[PDB]
Amino acid sequence: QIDKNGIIKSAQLHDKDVGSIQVQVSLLTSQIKQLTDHLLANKKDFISKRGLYAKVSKRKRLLKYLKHNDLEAYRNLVKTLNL
Amino acid sequence: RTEKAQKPKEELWDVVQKMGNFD
């Protein structure tokens, strides 16, 4: 449990959110950075690799659906920070 | 819960009953 209460309560997309697209993807990317640092420290951890791929692709399809679903509710985290 | 009760028809005695008076 890296982050559970930080980004989903300090950021409110709509009137109130306990679980949504962008809070979930922001927490997901925070855990993505944490897991990338972990696997750089320990290279033989593959469960994290598969989990990260699942997380990033679920985020991508989240954004893809939210394209048409809402006019603009995704232009806060569509990028990646690993370079 | 039910708010619209249309087509009054229910199934409660769904156990068979047949073979009336036989000689």
Partner: protein
């Protein structure tokens, strides 16, 4: 036509008329059999003592 009971592990619809009664209990089969017998015994002009009479039995299986 076949008359059957249904006790613990079968459908009640395997016969024509439905009777879910049981006889494994010691105090059951006594009055069950008496009431079944006196429901037909009247046809042959023979004694009928369990059809609407207060006669009843409370006995263990033996």
């Amino acid at each position: 036509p076949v008359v059957a009971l249904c006790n613990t592990n079968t459908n009640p619809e395997l016969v024509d008329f439905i009777i879910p009664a049981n006889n494994h209990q010691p105090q059951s089969t006594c009055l069950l059999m008496n009431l079944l017998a006196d429901a037909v015994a009247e046809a042959k002009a023979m004694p009928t003592m369990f059809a609407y009479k207060p006669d009843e039995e409370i006995q263990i299986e033996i």
